[PDB]
Design a protein around this nucleic acid. Sequence first.
RNA 1: AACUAAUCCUAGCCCUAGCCCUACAAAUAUAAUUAUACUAUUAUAUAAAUCAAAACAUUUAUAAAAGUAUUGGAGAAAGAAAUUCGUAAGGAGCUAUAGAACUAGUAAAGGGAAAGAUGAAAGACUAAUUAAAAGUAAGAACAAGCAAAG
RNA 2: UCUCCAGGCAUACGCGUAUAACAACUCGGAUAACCAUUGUUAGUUAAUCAGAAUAGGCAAUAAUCACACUAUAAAUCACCUAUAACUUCUCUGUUAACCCAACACCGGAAUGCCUAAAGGAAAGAUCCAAAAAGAUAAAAGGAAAAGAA
RNA 3: AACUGUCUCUUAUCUUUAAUCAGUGAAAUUGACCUUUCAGUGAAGAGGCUGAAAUAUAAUAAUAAGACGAGAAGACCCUAUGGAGCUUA
Lengths: 125, 93, 242, 114, 198
Amino acid sequence: ARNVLYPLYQLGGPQLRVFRTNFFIQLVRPGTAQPEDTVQFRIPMEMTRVDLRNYLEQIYNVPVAAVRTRVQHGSNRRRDHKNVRIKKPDYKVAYVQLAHGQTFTFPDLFPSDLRCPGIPSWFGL
Amino acid sequence: AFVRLTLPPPKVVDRWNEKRALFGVYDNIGILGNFEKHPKELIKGPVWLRGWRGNELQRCVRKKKFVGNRMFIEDLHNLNKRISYLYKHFNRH
Amino acid sequence: PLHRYPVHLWQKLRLRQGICARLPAHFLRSLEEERTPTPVHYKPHGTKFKINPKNGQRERVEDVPIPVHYPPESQQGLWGGEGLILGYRYANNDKLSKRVKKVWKPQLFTRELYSEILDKKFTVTVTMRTLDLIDEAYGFDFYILKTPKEDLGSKFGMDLKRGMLLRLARQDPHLHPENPERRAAIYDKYRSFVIPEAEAEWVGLTLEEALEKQRLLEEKDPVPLFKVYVEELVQRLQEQVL
Amino acid sequence: PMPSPERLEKVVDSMDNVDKVVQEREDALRLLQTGQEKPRPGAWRRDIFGRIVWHKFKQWPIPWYLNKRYNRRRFFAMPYVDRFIRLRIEKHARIEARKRSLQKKKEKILHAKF
Amino acid sequence: YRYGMSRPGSIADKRKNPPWSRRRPVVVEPISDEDWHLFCGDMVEILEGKDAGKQGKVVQVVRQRNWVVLEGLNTHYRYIGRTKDHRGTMIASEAPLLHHQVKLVDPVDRKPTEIQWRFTEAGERVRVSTRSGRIIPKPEFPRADGIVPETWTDGPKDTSVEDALERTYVPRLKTLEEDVMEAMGIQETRRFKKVYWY
RNA sequence: AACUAAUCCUAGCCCUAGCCCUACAAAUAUAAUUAUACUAUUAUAUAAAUCAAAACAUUUAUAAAAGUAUUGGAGAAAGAAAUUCGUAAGGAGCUAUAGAACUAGUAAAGGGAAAGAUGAAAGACUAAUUAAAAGUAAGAACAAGCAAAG
RNA sequence: UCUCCAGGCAUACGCGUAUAACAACUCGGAUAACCAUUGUUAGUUAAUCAGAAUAGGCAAUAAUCACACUAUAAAUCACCUAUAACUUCUCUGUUAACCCAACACCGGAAUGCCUAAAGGAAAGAUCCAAAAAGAUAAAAGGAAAAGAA
RNA sequence: AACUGUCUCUUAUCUUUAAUCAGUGAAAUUGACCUUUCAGUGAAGAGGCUGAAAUAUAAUAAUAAGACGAGAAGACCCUAUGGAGCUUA
């Protein structure tokens, strides 16, 4: 869950449970060359890789072997008509390697007469 | 310079409207009203100059007295500085 | 634009509105009333008439009070109306002499006074004038109680007055502990200043303290709407039974 | 292009509607048991600029009195803010005066147009 | 920003009202929600215009400009499909009509009768003709998406009609989080220690 | 009928009147905007001078009586009273070099801009209007000369 | 492929998408080509690289291959005794020909490695003017070699 | 002192510049000018006045020796029964 307050933990405190998840993730075709078992995901910047591991394992029942995550800086060079810099939203790219020997491949989404010119053909005259 | 390339629309004005028609009425209130109410009493406008006239310095000084307590702090300081210039110009030149 | 009320009336409006209105009437009267402190360093004109310059005729007179500075240390002490006079002096008391920047200092002291009501001796900053007033007051406790705030010129003294007034008001056994017979004599001796407990609490309280105190008095924990609906439901059901 | 983009909007509307319904049930029970209109403790506090703003209380492992940093945080207005308060009142009056000027110019064209 | 026939925010609207445009604003007489009586699908008679006196059904209403658009009326001619290979085909293009340029039509008698707004027994506001008083019912307009609700057939991920209408909530003193625990049997015995909120 | 250009009317302002007032999440004073401990925590002096006294030094304002008496390097100036008296939206303003600096406080204290123009409809192919500034072109020049005059 | 040139590569600091592909050829490069410009899309993957308990008791002798050897310029928490806690891998940085000098500046810019295996092109074309600037060469002479006062 | 193209005494080649083609494109400046020579006049003084003389139009390419060149409040020194400021015991 993002943009929400999480309880502070003290010794002996309750285990943290998120009953409803506000994290929304997008599976993206690998821009770079990656192993087939590896899967790329665009995820909220506040999500941890453990959260993704728990997220995939619990919500989607997907076995995960390894996870690698990177933060892509959003370009701020672009400027509007007022010369005010426009910042691309920063997104986090997560490389997830499947377990159990599973492999992944991105699906193929989106698989007048010439002799008489100047007189309109309408004229019979 | 250059001038407009289009003519403005014609305008018609009524000279017998109530305001123009009744302009000046009751101006003889004092003479015809037994002088109970002076025509100066009929003046409506800024408080400090109702029935009163004076030079710019006098008008400014009277304005300060009438609404000095009800004026803004920034305006009061500006008025004080403006009064200084007016006082020197009239009273020393 | 122009404010309908002058700036000085803004303070009056604030006092007349909000929690200020909700303040106790007795305390509000004490704050609203102003009593002039007893003159010490200047005397008002003995005669009410003098010669007007422009007309050269006898005219009514006005009084110019001398500026006297009372430092906050006086509010932490018990000064008998004495104060620091800050200004300019003409040397040798002749206008023809030089003007010298002068700060006039009344002789200040720290002394101990015994309070029968509080059964304790308090060491406090005091002036010789206060000591004479205490003797004239027939006791230190009398001076604190008898003297008004302005003449007393002491926040601590007013605070002492607050404690003394409350002690008298409640007939608290704290006075002269282990001596109930002696306690009654002190209360009888200072019976004149016995007042309602509510008034005594607010005597000498500062404006910021009074506002916070009133806020603390009126602050109340949020009502659980379950309880509110229970009371409302019972009332309607009880009315229905009728 | 994304096929049937309205699908995403419909789901978000469904998801948003779910949250308010769940929040409504939580809000109703919270009010009954405690009477609090806000899930998180809070109060109105004065900042150093003299404004009155709702301050949401934060849970700490230590108390405020032993939390020197919390005491270091300023919830009090300085004496000089009185001038700013007068300016704020004057600024509000100026805005209303400018608003009337804005209306007057609009009125002129109404006469010109009609 | 001058409102035009082009929908606000469209490419035509952006060209119509570019960021730097400061044209002399066009003043439109404000009309209250109660005052306004023209709605899409309403049969109205054009008081003045190209097709003045021809009754038509409203299809678009730009209330900001007090404009009512009648399909196939107030029509000028433009070319569709203009290209290099072909000159193009002439088509009908409608122009906006101001509110004063149209009037509502009494159903029984086809005339431009002035109307006054009045409530009914159900409480729904209905226009009543000032003369020959009669109720002009609100016209029926098809859904913008073109979907007739009943005719619609559930596609993938679409709950059946009965499922949506079913009510399963039982009033109880438990939140969703608490109720979820009971159904799935989540139990937590650990307790947070005292926290000083401030 | 020529290129460069030019054209326009509202963006709004200004002064009085009236009116006082009492109306997302997340993060933050730590290093503000850093999701939880550290380290206790905090504004404000006569208003002055400039200035006037042609310098400069005491000094220099900021309803009638009356700018009078008094006060003052008696000079620049300052200046009472007594005693009478006191009921209660508009513009012979501005219209893009004007009017608020403003379309805008936008593009270290602090400083602080530039500009826009069709029509009823652009779900009518975006409007016209002008021998109209200087600058140029159409159309370089022809012994002799403040360039014009007779 | 040929002719020729010879400070190259990492990190720090700074910059913040200037990175790359595609599409454009108007503006930006102090002119073009070509892009560093314009638009679109992609990118930088970390348990290992980098950044983000307490109370007492008690410590003489530099280094220099530390030995000898001397010296003066004077240069070295630990560990014990108790108390307390009791099973952990997330978060963040990672691109680039990049930064400070108004600039694709000529200089400014910390450290390690290494000196070509790394890194590069002086020639917009034509002509072979004079004059001017730099460099090389001198028949005979030698201020009209580097020594003295 | 020698040494050498520094010079007696200059020459030659290479590079830069130079010249031509194409692309791009400033700055100080600017009353208007149909912008001559000689003698005179004048304030040291004339393309423009007086009197002589010369003169198709338009373009194009070269050089800085002298007029002890034109000049400024540049440079330099000294003065005051001149001012004003400063230090005081």
